[model samples]
Target chain A: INFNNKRTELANKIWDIFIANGYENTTLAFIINKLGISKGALYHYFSSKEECADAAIENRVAFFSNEVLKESEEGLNSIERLKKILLAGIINSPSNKIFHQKLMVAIIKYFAPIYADIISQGNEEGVFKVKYPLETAEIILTLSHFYLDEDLFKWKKEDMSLKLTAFKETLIKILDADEDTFD
Target chain B: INFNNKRTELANKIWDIFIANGYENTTLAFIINKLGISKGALYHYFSSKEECADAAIENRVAFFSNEVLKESEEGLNSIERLKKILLAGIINSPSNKIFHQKLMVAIIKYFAPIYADIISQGNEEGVFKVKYPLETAEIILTLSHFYLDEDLFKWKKEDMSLKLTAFKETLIKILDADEDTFD
Candidate 1:
């Protein structure tokens, strides 16, 4: 394999470790012992565990996010695609609840640009109306990812459903779309 | 001081230490030594530095946030008051950048209910329009506090100003208010 390919493999391995062992629980010693790599070799690639974690998140999480967007874009208009992507839990892969919890902001940041582009397309189609497409995307994702999260807010299922409905209606109003747009 | 007052005083001391030092830099030993208290005394009040920090934040940050809201409520209608509170930087005190950074979510949480109450008042007065007042408050604050934060996004001044303007316009549209509502 080329040097770049080797580097990519190393990054992916770190990400897998992160998924298996929670982000806060994963230490340099754990990574070194897991990968059977010397401290020198690991430090050469990443100066610290946080640095390696960032690389891994960029390599794996971002790849998955982009792939999710790519797969959702086909055979659907921007609004449908947007709703599908929003309602879909395709990004919540792996049963590692802690990993998902820790990576929430990173995932949202990576997905915002892709979501923004789709919203821009919706604006062009006159289906979704918003003055600040990117800001709207960020706000929507932040609330959806952070507020509606059970881990964060710990709302009961029925209450979550009510809030979810409210979120849908609010988004419709925010986008200046029809009532049935998100429905 | 009474027992409850003593507990509050201890919490305030921990918070002051947090402001002087940084959150990540604080330790149980440091707090104990700083306050000249035994570990047992500290443990009786707060089991961990994090717990003490939370108490301190609740005691100090929440107090300041509530005060800001209370002070802003006079001589203004709900929409005008909302705009003023949104534009106000009264909570940015102490010159402790790290403290503010660490307590972003806590401050947002403490402030959201108050903001939501104002939005609800706006809805009642037909001055602001939204289906989910609480969710809207959370979304707007999350965007303004987290996304617009220079420490988080690192956008240049010009880009930040542009996004800020977009945020204002988008907020006005979302509330279904007039063009000059925020101005």
Candidate 2:
């Protein structure tokens, strides 16, 4: 299947704007202006603002879930794959500190219901073992939520690195992985 | 110190309403209507809606930070106290789910600057070893943030009991507690 790189590029640009300004203040007009694309040009690909937001978020989710996560699991078992995914997600998700603050607020506001439902289904399918899939999904989605706050943005690299490592380990352990599994 | 039982009672009522409806939909008029109190009566205590919301939230936070947490530390040392606090925060904080959702959204929306400063202070003081205390604070602030969401509102007594025990133990381990030192 052919990938739509142009659509992905547009989505990323919109995502960046949303992250910088916040979703509540973001507008379709601003997005169109920032992209320098005409209304007709934008609408040809996305039907409406909501649809565009959904597509952008979906693209982001897929970038993490499909490319980053799926790619990391090339030769790993389920447990190892999960650990790799967590590690990579922590280090590489586009929603890192620079963009996490506003993005998280937006996700909580506009995306939580659907995201939670998706997580619930994942848990039912044994993709996630946690008893509370929606909550877990919230945690996963907002992994950088805590760090992006002005207060936490100053953590020492040593401290931050260690905690990130510990958090990764704990998350894997919570998945009920064996002691000898993770690298 | 005089404990304002009346204020506490009003706060509980407000809490219940906020949980049932939500922070955004809750209003002073609604609160007064529910309590059957005249506007003058509320004004005698709180100056405005923001004050009332602040009191209600701080009341809940104080309960978790002081009452439940303090009591749970009856005979325990620092490590044990921390563990008990973590467990109780996870299992028994009043309306844990709703309280966290509304309170966190409010904090992010109305109090981000202040919250960020306080979190930064903690990091400066080395009070937290985590990479991102603000993020960890958010995580710790909401027990449901960590575990699976499927296990949240649906927690039965037995499930809660088990979780409380497991959480306490796991927390102690994570804190690197020496079991013998606790006693």
Candidate 3:
């Protein structure tokens, strides 16, 4: 593969490891051993750890965006379409909840445009009313992850579940969707 | 001041615990120990942990509502009123927002209702076209909270400021207000 592609793939692997583990816990040895690549190979792609994070966020975000676009059905109404986009964009996360929790930040970034577009469509249809799709999208992202993230301060599962329900209910309401159909 | 100043006084104390430590981290045991109150005395007010949270979230919501709403002038138009909310409530609201993040789920229902009240007044004045004031308010709350949250995503302060401005402009649009009256 070319330099860019190699960097992208390497970044992708590093991201996955970080996701399953965590940023603080993952170190030089962990990355190099996990990749089975030399230190020089890793450094060749990116100059430093901070640089890798930027690339990882970008590349993984693109991967998720592409996945959602091709995989998500387009014919649903705005709210349902939004639900599908958020649920789909969670990507092939490992069962470890924190793994997905950390990625929630990244997912929210790229997924924001998707949210903005759908809410805007809802607004145009008069079924939804929002002036700023992006901001509304960000709220949904923070809130959705805040409730779903397990260590978001050790919440009760039932309470967390109820909160997610509340989150969805309020989301459609906040979007100014004339209909209340987020099940 | 309340007729029973002590009751309101104690509830406020309980709220700070939940606010600083979060719902899961705060418990009846914690409350009792923290306040040096007898469980019997605590039961004189609340029956269970579930009830405490329900009461706590509601009380604090009203508290924040009154807190922000008072800062807003009585005669402002919807866009102007929203501008006040964003300017007054949000501009100085970063630290406050952090404490409130955990309760955001419970707060969704709490906030939208308050926001609806503001926008509905705007509706009477034709400063806004929000068919569902509550939903519009929910959108406004969600968008504001999302942007103000520093860790929502890795953001540059320069870009974050731009994003917040975008949030406000869209908010005026989402509320269907005619103009951006924010300074």
The best candidate in terms of lDDT: 1
- What are the candidates' individual DockQ scores? 0.36, 0.07, 0.12
Question: What is the C-alpha lDDT profile of model 3 across A1-183, one tens digit per residue?
Answer: 578877888888988887787765677778899999888888888876656666776788888798877876757777678766766633321123323433666777778888888888888777876666777787677666554555643556666655565566556546766445665
**For residues B13-43, could you state the per-residue lDDT of candidate 2 as single tens digits?**
7877876876656778888999899999998
Per-residue lDDT over B30-97 for candidate 3, one digit per residue giving the tens place of the 0 to 100 score: 99999899998888878776556556666666677678766776766666565555554312122233
Off by over 4 Å in 3: A89-102, B1-146, B149-183
Interface RMSD of 1: 7.2
- Higher TM-score: candidate 2 or 3? 3
Model 1, B1-183: lDDT tens per residue?
477688889988988898788776678898889999999998887766656866887788767886886677465678777867786663222223335543666767778887888888888898877788877787778678766776554467767877788778767866878888866
Which portions of model 2 show Cα errors greater than 4 Å?
A1-13, A28-54, A69-162, A165-183, B1-14, B27-54, B69-99, B102-144, B151-183
lDDT of 2 by residue, A72-173 (tens): 534444454444444443221211321333334444433334445544544555654555544444454444344333343344555666546545554543
For this target, which candidate reaches the highest TM-score against the unseen true structure?
Answer: 1
lDDT of 2 at B94: 21
All candidates' lDDT scores? Answer: 0.73, 0.51, 0.65
